[PDB]
């Protein structure tokens, strides 16, 4: 089958600038003056949405800032100006040969001003304590860039064993990230220690944001 | 209002069969082809097949032996059947309408997540997350809903039956001990909590469970 | 008139045809002059037969010249079919000579025989020259093949008359002439059969024989194109040597990608060797 | 073998062709028998020429039978072109007889003349029967026209020999025979020119003459169809009598209504008399 | 050109029933198995909206209750079940021959329960009095059926000269009508009379609804 | 979001020329034909012409001598020009996108009403209509806005800048003395009037006149 390679895997573009995504085909997808290549956009938690068909035609209902070009084996999708909602994964698909195949996908993340994470600490609930566990939650909301560090302190002692990290995709409105760190422990472990703290280290400031609670 | 909706099991035992029904509205299957495409993190988007208005079917070569697509025009439904389901078949399956006269797909269904494993369906466990004591009252207060120990994916997490949709951030699930952990965080004005009633609704279609847990101050 | 000559000498086939035609016409003219001078009858008959034979070389040369003419409104495919026609005429020429040769022999059998030899050797020499010039003959394939067969028939006739004359001089066989005439007529017909087969197949709008075996595979690949329901009204024929024309109608799905189907069908039949292809695409109701 | 006969007698053209062929073959057989019995040479030569002439009637009858055969994979258009071929062969037959008639006359001029008359009157009677049977002749048009022309050539030859014999009996003109032979040869060629023109036009894939004048108006109406940008690669040719094949390619707007354009183009060329039409539709980029 | 006749000009159908509209062509609009006839719906104050193309194909985005059938010269558009918003004018158009032509149009009005008109009287405004005129307005809202009678009384005297009647189209939600009757008079005419009344006569009740005012 | 918008004069003098510009969004004029169609009460819908992506134009036979359609692909505009405008040309003119591969029109513009007369543009006169005195207070109270003496058509009448859109009934205009009369009626809760500020906004594009008349109790 025809193999489609999308380069780069991820491209960083600020607001109002131009983004360019390339799709390369192992064999020509052209027939008699028509390139049978299509561009789709997939947002987080949403099905793929058709942007371009036959490599240069704008699908009815999509913004004019999307453009397509190329022929034979080289194809380019261009976004100008780049908006906040354009943060998604863009795929190229060929229909020239059976079977239909899709590109690997290029993820577009938005460049903006750095934002300090908002840190919220939640102790394990009473119902979870009755169940026999204890999950302490650290929510780090609305921060840019993506890279961030989370550490758990049990009365000043570091924990790295039962920490699970969950990362959301970039927001479509304000272009930030959310980072949920859960620490799961047994009931006796929760009861034998008193002060639980979570610190977040981000590039915005050298002083980590620490949220603490007792019992 | 062209819409495609997929209905099928969320969990399929290994070496068993997967059956999905795609119901379409806003167009007729007498002049539109319907494609079936699956998306998985390991392999990305993979075209599975197409069914044409007269009933002609065109399959992927890698699935020709274990795939069958049929349809009924009267009830406007397309039936997708796969045999010998292994673990690599865990993916989100979409039925898409063919873009007329083109090799693209213009309208996609929401998709159904199908996982292949020997584990059994586990109802979710819902826990509240209120800020510790009254410290740091501020003007913006964050609340959380924790969904632990459910299987398989996914669960729909909403706040106030979807009315409170601003500042709601739901995090991807994490697999540990063959079970799933999920968290949801919502930012709400401090003057409205605990003054106004706020709840987290967790819906698990696989185990058929809807939990409207009301968060309360500690 | 004048402009035709520079076109004839431009091409190798046309130049060779013109030179051979001039040689044959000069030989026939000299034979006529000697026959009227030496009050002979066989000489005059042979000269008339030589003019008739040179008419076939005229047909071949004219076909070679006309085949290169550009297409116009009346002749939308051009004049390439002339090549085929030339061959078909040449073969018919041969069939209408061999039979008469046959006839003559039978008459000479049912009649007391009562020069015409040194002339035959010179005609044999001219035929050898023609064989040397047009050896590769057996759009110009059918012209060259027909001209080669015509020269071969002349050479066979010369060999037959020479053999009869030697056999009835040295050993006195009065039966040698009829058998030799019949044998050369049969050989002429046998030699001309394949050219006539090829020309008639082209002129009956038959499927090109070199393309017939690959056509079912082409149809199968077309039917395997997405959105194709059926093929109908397929026609493939030979315009001239190695130039194939195809027409077909596709029934496709009502939403089928006709641009892609058209390009794929053209690719499939281009790999099969079809030069000119017409694909009508009809969208089905359901 | 046996099944062919019931097919021949089914059709009027085939039945008449078969009866005329049987009459000619019986006449030639009787001439051969009388020539071998009465040790004549002109009788044998005339019988051989009559067999050769009856070969053309064989060709016409075979074409009439084969033309009705159903199309198959090799012959996708059927065998209708046989009709055209028959005519083309008949004309060639005539051209290859008239010339020889010419030749014979010239020889009889350059030679002391030294029955062959009552036989000629019987041949004249048979030719009159053929004229009566095939009067309407001049797919079966080209077969009937060619057969009619062949019988006319035979009738002209009989009239020529009869006139020469009377003129050199009653009034003793020794020059009458060459002039009459040349005149009948010229008349044969003139008579055969139009049939050869029509057959050659069909066999060169020429635009049908009855359709050529209406084609520009058809093109103009096609160009006036909404969404049509241009026409190209138009080809119209004659398959057989009154059966026209057309192929064309349209460039249309990228969003053009191809179903409607296709139906309109077919209507336009159906009103012009095109039986079989192939319309390829290409969507332009812009 | 091809003449399209739509019958009936108006058809009355109740809720949840079936409505049938016919289009008749002077010449055949068919070509090679395709009928080149299209059905449009035009609501009040809105551009025509495409419902059916090629006489039997449902345009993407319109409700499944619309159906098309017919061939050659006879075509039928069927609505089942008939909803409140279906009250509009339906047109047939042919694309088989240049020029494109449209049908005369069939107006669909909805049958429901009869409603008594709501009558409101508005005396001429002070600004209009300063301008030199006087327009008294009678609004008759939310009534079924359409037929209704409006009469103006000037101290019990009938007026029929300066009365202008304006009728709205049937509502798309509740399937009623609104009837605005304006009486235009000079300032002196308005000032020489005191009691102005407007009565509405409707088939709902035999007693006309009369709205009165003084000065 | 495929949209077509027509901009042109609302009034054209007789025997003059009419120029309309249709601006399109959501699709490109490089692969879509655009039809021009006019609708008048006397003659109904009449197809005027079509312009194709390469620039080919196909006109109605009755307008071939006085109609010209052009376009510019860069700014995505279609220009409609008519000469010798008589009174029978008074109609609403729409630019419509051609339905792809069909002879139908799938997306229509809002249309521009063009009237042909020798009368001049007249700004509207806006008057309020409050119930007489306090009689019949009830729970539902009807208010009115009167637009008299404007020319030509149309005028946009809204209530509270479009926020109050329930119970708003606008009546067709009436032609008397070459001028137009129009009425608008709105039903509002009695507790909100005159407690809440309510206004009628009349926008006459031809005379560029916007009147936010605030209705007051008598």
- The beta-carbon neighbor of B53 closest among C257, C260, C286 is C286
Q: State whether residue F3 sits within 8 Å of chain A by CB.
A: no
Q: Do B54 and C257 touch (CB under 8 A)?
A: no
Q: Please list every residue in chain B whose beta carbon sits closer than 8 Å to the beta carbon of residue E57.
A: 28, 31
Altogether, the residues listed in chain A come to a count of: 215
Chains that touch E (3 or more CB pairs under 8 A): B, C, D, F
Chains E and A touch (3+ CB pairs under 8 A): no
- The beta-carbon neighbor of E141 closest among F46, F108, F185 is F185
Q: Is the peptide bond before A99 cis (omega within 30 degrees of 0)?
A: yes
H or E segment and range at residue E182: strand E177-186
| Closest chain D residue to the Cα of A56, Cα to Cα | D285
According to DSSP, residue F161 is labeled G
| Closest chain D residue to the Cα of A35, Cα to Cα | D285
Q: Please list every residue in chain D whose beta carbon sits closer than 8 Å to the beta carbon of residue E98.
A: 224, 226
**Residues ≥6 apart with Cβ < 8 Å to D175:** D109
Q: Do E57 and B31 touch (CB under 8 A)?
A: yes
Interface size E-F, in CB pairs within 8 Å, comes to: 133
| Closest chain E residue to the Cα of B28, Cα to Cα | E58
> Which of left, alpha, beta for D128 (phi over 0: left; psi -120 to 50: alpha)?
alpha
User: Quick one: how far is CA D97 from the chain centroid?
Assistant: 16
Q: Do A31 and C226 touch (CB under 8 A)?
A: no
Chains that touch A (3 or more CB pairs under 8 A): B, C, D, F
Annotate chain C with DSSP letters as a single string. -HHHHHHHHHSHHHHHHHHHHHHHHHHHHHHHHHHHHTT-SHHHHHHHHHHHHHHHHHHHHHHHHHHTSPP-SSSTT-STHHHHHHHHHHHHHHHHHHHHHHHHHHHHHSS-----SHHHHHHHHHHHHHHHHTTTT---HHHHHHHHHHHHHHHHHHHHHHHHHHHHHHS--SSHHHHHHHHHHHHHHHHHHHHHHHHHHHHTTPPPHHHHTTHHHHHHHHHTSTTEEEEEEEEEEEEETTEEEEEEEEEE-TT--HHHHHHHHHHHHHHTT-SEEEEEEEE---
Shortest Cα–Cα distance, A103 to chain C (Å): 20
Q: What tokens were used for E73?
A: 């010269």
Q: Do A32 and D282 touch (CB under 8 A)?
A: yes
Q: What Å distances lie between residue A20 and A42, A86, B102, F165, CA to CA?
A: 16, 12, 24, 45
Instruction: Count CB atoms within 10 A of the CB of residue D280.
Output: 22
Q: State whether residue C220 sits within 8 Å of chain A by CB.
A: no
- The beta-carbon neighbor of A31 closest among C224, C226, C263 is C263
Q: Is the peptide bond before E179 cis (omega within 30 degrees of 0)?
A: no
Token look-up 């131009």 returns A18
Torsion angles phi and psi, residue F166, rounded to 5? -95, 130
Instruction: Count CB atoms within 10 A of the CB of residue D268.
Output: 19
Token look-up 């983004």 returns A19
Distance (Å, rounded) from C-alpha E193 to C-alpha D81? 102
Torsion angles phi and psi, residue A105, rounded to 5? 105, 135
- A119 by Cβ neighbours in 10 Å (0-12 / 13-18 / 19+) ranks as buried
Q: State whether residue F10 sits within 8 Å of chain E by CB.
A: no
Q: What tokens were used for E203?
A: 């088939």
Q: Is the peptide bond before D207 cis (omega within 30 degrees of 0)?
A: no
Distance (Å, rounded) from C-alpha C81 to C-alpha C238? 9
Interface size A-D, in CB pairs within 8 Å, comes to: 3
F102, HSE (Cβ side, Cα atoms, 13 Å): 29
User: Quick one: how far is CA C155 from the chain centroid?
Assistant: 18
Enumerate the β-bridge partners of residue B128. B145
Q: State whether residue C267 sits within 8 Å of chain A by CB.
A: yes
| Closest chain E residue to the Cα of F138, Cα to Cα | E120
Q: What tokens were used for B186?
A: 């919502």
Chains that touch F (3 or more CB pairs under 8 A): A, B, D, E
| Beta strands E10-14; E106-111: pairing state | parallel
Q: What tokens were used for E197?
A: 């009344």
Distance (Å, rounded) from C-alpha C105 to C-alpha F109? 93
Residues 14-43 of B with CB under 8 A from A: 35, 39
H or E segment and range at residue A213: strand A205-213
Shortest Cα–Cα distance, F68 to chain E (Å): 16
Pick among B27, B57, B61, B101 to test the C interface (most C CBs inside 10 A): B101
Three state DSSP letters for E103-163:
CCCEEEEEECCCECCEEEEECCCHHHHHHCEEEEEEEEEEEECCCCEEEEEECCEEECCCE
Q: Do D229 and F33 touch (CB under 8 A)?
A: no
Own/partner long-range contacts of A112-116 (Cβ < 8 Å, ≥24 apart):
A112/A14, A112/A15, A112/A144, A112/A175, A113/A144, A114/A144, A114/A145, A114/A203, A114/A204, A115/A142, A115/A143, A115/A144, A115/A176, A115/A204, A116/A143, A116/A202, A116/A204, A116/A205, A116/A209
Distance (Å, rounded) from C-alpha D41 to C-alpha D47? 10
Annotate chain B with DSSP letters as a single string. --EEEEE--SEE-TTS-EEEEEEEESS-TTS--EEEEEEETTTEEEEEEEE-TTS-EEE-GGGTTTEEEEEETTTTEEEEEE-S--GGG-EEEEEEEEPTTSSSEEEE---EEEEE-SPPPB--EEEEE--STT-S--SEEEEEEEEEEEBSS--EEEEGGGT--TTEEEPPPEEETTEEEEEEEEEEEGGGTTTS--EEEEEETTTTEEEEEEP---
Distance (Å, rounded) from C-alpha C213 to C-alpha B32? 36
The beta-strand segments (E) located in E30-127 are: 30-31, 34-35, 37-42, 49-53, 57-58, 66-71, 74-79, 89-94, 101-102, 106-111, 118-122
| Beta strands B11-12; B112-116: pairing state | parallel
Distance (Å, rounded) from C-alpha F110 to C-alpha F6? 7
User: Quick one: how far is CA E100 from the chain centroid?
Assistant: 26
Shortest Cα–Cα distance, A49 to chain C (Å): 19
Q: Please list every residue in chain A whose beta carbon sits closer than 8 Å to the beta carbon of residue C259.
A: 31-32, 34, 36, 54
Pick among A29, A30, A31 to test the C interface (most C CBs inside 10 A): A31
Shortest Cα–Cα distance, D26 to chain C (Å): 18
Distance (Å, rounded) from C-alpha D179 to C-alpha D184? 9
Q: At what angle do helices C215-223 and C258-271 cross, to 10 degrees?
A: 160
Pick among D139, D205, D275, D279 to test the C interface (most C CBs inside 10 A): D205
Give the neighbor-by-neighbor strand order of the sheet with E133-143.
E118-122, E133-143, E177-186, E163-167
Q: Do B128 and A98 touch (CB under 8 A)?
A: no
Q: What Å distances lie between residue C270 and C242, C244, C265, C267, C276, CA to CA?
A: 13, 10, 8, 5, 8
Shortest Cα–Cα distance, D285 to chain A (Å): 8
Q: What tokens were used for F166?
A: 């329930």
> Which of left, alpha, beta for B156 (phi over 0: left; psi -120 to 50: alpha)?
beta
**Residues ≥6 apart with Cβ < 8 Å to C115:** C40
Interface size A-B, in CB pairs within 8 Å, comes to: 136
Torsion angles phi and psi, residue E10, rounded to 5? -140, 140
User: Quick one: how far is CA C253 from the chain centroid?
Assistant: 46
Distance (Å, rounded) from C-alpha B27 to C-alpha A20? 35
Shortest Cα–Cα distance, C278 to chain B (Å): 20
User: Quick one: how far is CA B8 from the chain centroid?
Assistant: 11
Distance (Å, rounded) from C-alpha B185 to C-alpha A147? 20
H or E segment and range at residue D276: strand D276-283
Q: Please list every residue in chain D whose beta carbon sits closer than 8 Å to the beta carbon of residue A32.
A: 282
Report the alpha-carbon angle A71-A77-A78, nearest 5. 125
Q: State whether residue A36 sits within 8 Å of chain C by CB.
A: yes
Task: State whether the Cα torsion A10-A11-A12-A15 is positive or negative.
Answer: negative
Instruction: Count CB atoms within 10 A of the CB of residue A194.
Output: 11
Q: How was this structure determined?
A: cryo-EM
Enumerate the β-bridge partners of residue B168. B186
Q: State whether residue E28 sits within 8 Å of chain D by CB.
A: no
**Cβ-based interface (< 8 Å): residues of A facing F:** 57-58, 60-62, 64
Q: Do C103 and D45 touch (CB under 8 A)?
A: yes
Distance (Å, rounded) from C-alpha B197 to C-alpha D260? 63
According to DSSP, residue A126 is labeled H
b/e burial code for range B22-54 (CB count within 10 A of at least 16 → b):
bebebbbbebbbbbbbbbbeeebbbbbbbbbbb
Q: What tokens were used for F201?
A: 């906004």
Token look-up 């494993």 returns B117
């Amino acid at each position: 089958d025809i193999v489609l390679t999308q380069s780069p895997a991820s491209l960083a573009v600020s607001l109002r600038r131009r983004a360019t995504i390339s799709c390369r085909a192992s064999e020509s997808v052209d027939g008699y003056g028509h390139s049978f290549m299509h561009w789709y956009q997939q947002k987080s938690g949403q099905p793929p949405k058709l942007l371009i068909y036959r490599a240069s035609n704008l699908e009815s209902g999509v913004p004019a800032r999307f453009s397509g070009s190329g022929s034979r084996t080289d194809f380019t999708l261009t976004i100008d100006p780049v908006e906040a909602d354009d943060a998604a994964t863009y795929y190229c698909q060929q229909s020239n040969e059976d079977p239909y195949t899709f590109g690997s996908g290029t993820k577009l993340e938005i460049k903006r001003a750095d934002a300090a994470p908002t840190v919220s600490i939640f102790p394990p609930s009473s119902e979870q304590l009755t169940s026999g566990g204890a999950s302490v939650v650290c929510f780090l909301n609305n921060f840019y860039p993506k890279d961030i560090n989370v550490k758990w302190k049990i009365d000043g002692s570091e924990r790295q064993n039962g920490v699970l990290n969950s990362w959301t995709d970039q927001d479509s409105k304000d272009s930030t990230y959310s980072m949920s760190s859960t620490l799961t422990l047994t009931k006796d472990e929760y009861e034998r220690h008193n002060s639980y703290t979570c610190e977040a280290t981000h590039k915005t400031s050298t002083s980590p944001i620490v949220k603490s609670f007792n019992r | 209002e062209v819409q495609l909706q997929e209905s099928g099991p969320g969990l399929v035992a290994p070496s068993q069969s997967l059956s999905i029904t795609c119901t379409v509205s806003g167009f007729s299957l007498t002049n539109y082809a319907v494609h079936w495409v699956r998306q998985s993190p390991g392999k990305g988007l993979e075209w599975l097949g197409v069914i044409w208005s007269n009933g002609r079917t065109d399959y992927n070569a890698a699935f020709i032996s274990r795939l069958s697509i049929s349809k009924d025009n009267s009830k406007s439904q397309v039936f997708f059947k796969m045999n010998s389901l292994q673990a690599d078949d865990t993916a989100i399956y979409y039925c898409a309408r063919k873009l007329a006269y083109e090799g693209a797909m213009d309208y996609w269904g929401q998709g159904t997540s199908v996982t292949v494993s020997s584990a059994k369906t586990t109802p979710p466990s819902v826990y509240p997350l209120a800020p510790g004591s009254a410290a740091q009252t501020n003007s913006m207060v964050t609340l959380g809903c924790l969904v632990k120990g459910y299987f398989p994916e996914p669960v729909t997490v909403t706040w106030n039956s979807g009315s409170l949709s601003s500042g709601v951030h739901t995090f991807p699930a994490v697999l540990q001990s063959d079970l799933y952990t999920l968290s949801s965080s919502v930012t709400v004005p401090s003057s409205t909590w605990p003054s106004e009633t706020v709840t987290c609704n967790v819906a698990h279609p696989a185990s058929s469970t809807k939990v409207d847990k009301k968060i309360v101050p500690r | 008139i004048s402009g035709w000559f520079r076109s004839i000498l431009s091409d190798k086939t046309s130049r060779n045809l013109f030179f051979f035609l001039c040689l044959n016409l000069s030989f026939a003219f000299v034979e006529l002059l000697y026959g009227i001078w030496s009050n002979c009858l066989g000489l005059i008959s042979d000269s008339f037969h030589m003019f008739f034979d040179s008419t076939a070389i005229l047909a071949g040369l004219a076909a070679s010249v006309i085949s290169k003419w550009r297409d116009n409104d009346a002749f939308s495919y051009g004049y390439v079919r002339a090549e085929v026609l030339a061959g078909f005429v040449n073969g018919l020429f041969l069939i209408f000579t061999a039979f008469f040769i046959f006839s003559e022999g039978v008459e000479r059998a049912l009649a007391p025989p009562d020069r015409l030899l040194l002339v035959s050797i010179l005609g044999f020499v001219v035929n050898l020259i023609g064989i040397f010039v047009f050896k590769h003959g057996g759009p110009s394939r059918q012209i060259l093949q027909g001209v080669f067969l015509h020269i071969l028939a002349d050479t066979l006739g010369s060999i037959g008359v020479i053999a009869s004359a030697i056999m009835m001089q040295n050993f006195g066989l009065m039966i040698a002439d009829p058998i030799c005439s019949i044998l050369i007529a049969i050989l002429i017909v046998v030699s001309v059969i394949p050219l006539l087969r090829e020309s008639v197949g082209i002129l009956m709008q038959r499927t090109p024989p070199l393309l017939e075996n690959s056509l079912p595979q082409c149809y199968q690949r077309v039917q395997q194109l997405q959105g194709v329901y059926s093929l109908q009204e397929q026609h493939f024929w030979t315009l001239c040597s190695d130039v194939y024309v195809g027409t077909l109608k596709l029934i496709v799905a009502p939403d089928a990608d006709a641009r892609w189907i058209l390009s794929q069908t053209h690719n499939i039949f281009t790999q099969a060797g079809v030069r000119q292809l017409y694909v009508q695409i009809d969208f089905a109701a359901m």
